[PDB]
Every structure is written in structure tokens, then in C-alpha cells.
């Protein structure tokens, strides 16, 4: 069975991938990944889907906890980023906006894998309250294979859901 | 300064209170609480406000992690609830909806302290995708003082923000 997000030991160079809130990640990808790198957030038996942005926030903050909150305010200055967060084919623009804020607040780097379910629009992102610096560096990869080619992740994790 | 949400040791009988995403909990309340019970989620220096539902999800899942995910699907059956979650004067309906789902998924009990910034309307809650059992038993307290009188929390935590 799937380990919890807190039952893996996150390390520098890890990439954490999330699929759309209702669809998740295709089985063709998941079936070729080791059991230990397919994580599932704990839920009670009769649960229903959690919001994707909440799922990513929970996962990011658990990883950051394991990494001692390096780079946080009132901690010694650290150079560089934490982990890399990957949204596979993100669908709902509000989730992506929330996740952009999350990643900017935590020093995690965000990647999107096309196709997106919305048009990427600086003005729309700004209207939602994001500053340009929060989203200016976000990479959009053409495909999952192109992402793997560009990034060559040391380890790749995938969030699964029931 | 404020301990992180993961730098407190949560215990049975704890109540975790969250104020609105735009203004938080009034200083008149916070000033009567011990420093150790005023938690702040870690952020980088130039961070901006995180979505309240993300803040509550992060805090709830960290508390549940400390409590060994008791009552989760892959675990022996447990009869009680976990902690109590309290929204002080919640403003944005979608946050409250997300938090209702979160609490139902984790076995945490939700309380709202009036006044709410939106209508408590079964039809509106249903339209947002919630099932009746998720919201039917949520306690709505007339005031903060009435909440304290009704619930007599063994310990009360409050989320703070910069």
C-alpha cells in the first residue's frame, strides 16, 4: 500500500508530482514507479476528494518540516531552493494560483507540464493577488518526457488518490 | 517568537482556532494566550498571505501526524474524534467549504464562531459539493465567550500571521 506523505524521507533533488484534482496521474506513469515513491495522504474510510491546493500544501509543508524549514524567516540564510513541485496537466486555475503562492512562500520551485486546462495569463495571475516575482520563473514543460529530459530528477514522487 | 505548527506537541482535548485570511484573531484574545499556544506556519522572509484553507489543512495534518493518523483507512477502527478545529468569524465561503471537507476526511470536529461573513445555507453548502453528513453537526457559537463557556477547551491554540 501507499506510504503516507510523512512516511517517506525527502531529500535534496526530489521532485514531487501532482495530477489534476479529479483525474490524478495516468496509470501508465504510476505503474512504472516504485511503490515507495507513490504517496497517499491519510484519510478516514468514507472520505471524499481533498482540494488539490490543500493536498500540495500538506505535502510541501511536510517535506519542508523534514528539511528543517531551511530558508524560513528567523533562521540562518540558505542559498538556493528546496524541492521541486510538478503539476501534471493542471486544470483549475485557482489551484495553480494557490500553489504558486505556496511555492513562493516556502522557496520550492514550481513546474507545470502542458497541456494546461487554462490559458497562462500574467494579468489573470496578478488579478488573483500574485506578484510577478512569484510566477515569473515557473517552467512549463511540453510533455512529461520533456520534463524528465530538462530536469533529470534524482527521485520522482507522485501523489495518488483513491 | 511563535513556534511552528510542528513545534508544539498536540494532545487530546486541544482546540485549534483560526481567524479570517485577511485579519486573523484580535489581539484582545491573543494577549490572554501563552506564547507557546500561538503558532505560526513557517514562511520565507518576503512571503505573502497563504490561503486559509491551506493553512488549516497544513495544521490539521501535522496534528494528525503527531497523533499517528488514528482513525485513518489502513488502521484499526477508532471510536472517537481527533481534535477540535475552530474558525473565528469565517469570511470566505469557499475556505469554510474546503475546511468542512478536510475535517470530515480526518475525523476532526469543526466549530464556527459567529458572526459569519456568509449565509449558513444547506443548499449553498450542497451546491459547493458537500454532503449533508459533512456539515449537519457543525457547532455554531454565538460569541467567543460563549464558545469558551460551552467547550471549556483543555488547551486553545491560535494561528497567527505577520
From Swiss-Prot, chains A, B:
Binding, S-adenosyl-L-methionine: 19, 41, 49, 159
Role this protein plays: Methylates the ribose at the nucleotide 34 wobble position in the two leucyl isoacceptors tRNA(Leu)(CmAA) and tRNA(Leu)(cmnm5UmAA). Catalyzes the methyl transfer from S-adenosyl-L-methionine to the 2'-OH of the wobble nucleotide.
NCBIfam families on file: PRK10358.1, tRNA_yibK_trmL
Biological classification of the source: Bacteria, Pseudomonadati, Pseudomonadota, Gammaproteobacteria, Pasteurellales
Compartment(s) where it occurs, according to its Swiss-Prot or TrEMBL record: Cytoplasm
Top-rank taxon, per record: Bacteria
The gene coding this protein: trmL
Gene Ontology molecular function terms on file: identical protein binding; RNA binding; tRNA (5-carboxymethylaminomethyluridine(34)-2'-O)-methyltransferase activity; tRNA (cytidine(34)-2'-O)-methyltransferase activity
Cellular compartments per GO CC: cytoplasm
GO terms, biological process: wobble position cytosine ribose methylation; wobble position uridine ribose methylation
Subunit structure: Homodimer.
Family: Belongs to the class IV-like SAM-binding methyltransferase superfamily. RNA methyltransferase TrmH family. TrmL subfamily.
Catalytic activity: cytidine(34) in tRNA + S-adenosyl-L-methionine = 2'-O-methylcytidine(34) in tRNA + S-adenosyl-L-homocysteine + H(+); 5-carboxymethylaminomethyluridine(34) in tRNA(Leu) + S-adenosyl-L-methionine = 5-carboxymethylaminomethyl-2'-O-methyluridine(34) in tRNA(Leu) + S-adenosyl-L-homocysteine + H(+)
E.C. no: 2.1.1.207
Protein name (database record): tRNA (cytidine(34)-2'-O)-methyltransferase
Main location, first listed in the record: cytoplasm
Keyword rRNA processing assigned: no
Protein keywords: Cytoplasm, Methyltransferase, S-adenosyl-L-methionine, Transferase, tRNA processing
Amino acid at each position: 500500500g501507499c506510504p503516507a506523505h510523512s512516511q517517506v524521507k525527502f531529500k535534496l533533488g526530489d521532485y514531487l508530482m501532482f495530477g489534476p484534482e479529479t483525474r490524478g496521474i495516468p496509470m501508465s506513469i504510476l505503474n512504472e514507479m516504485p511503490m515507495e515513491q507513490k504517496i497517499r495522504i491519510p484519510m478516514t474510510a468514507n472520505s471524499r476528494s481533498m482540494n488539490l491546493s490543500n493536498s500540495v500544501a500538506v505535502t510541501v509543508y511536510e517535506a519542508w518540516r523534514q528539511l528543517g524549514y531551511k530558508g524560513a524567516v528567523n533562521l540562518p540564510e540558505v542559498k538556493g531552493s528546496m524541492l521541486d513541485i510538478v503539476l501534471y496537466e493542471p486544470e483549475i486555475p485557482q489551484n495553480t494560483g494557490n500553489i504558486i503562492r505556496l511555492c513562493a512562500n516556502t522557496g520550492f520551485r514550481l513546474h507545470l507540464i502542458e497541456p494546461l486546462g487554462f490559458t497562462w495569463d500574467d494579468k489573470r495571475l496578478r488579478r488573483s493577488g500574485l506578484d510577478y516575482h512569484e510566477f515569473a520563473e515557473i517552467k512549463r514543460h511540453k510533455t512529461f518526457e520533456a520534463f524528465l529530459e530538462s530536469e533529470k530528477p534524482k527521485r520522482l514522487f507522485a501523489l495518488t488518490t483513491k
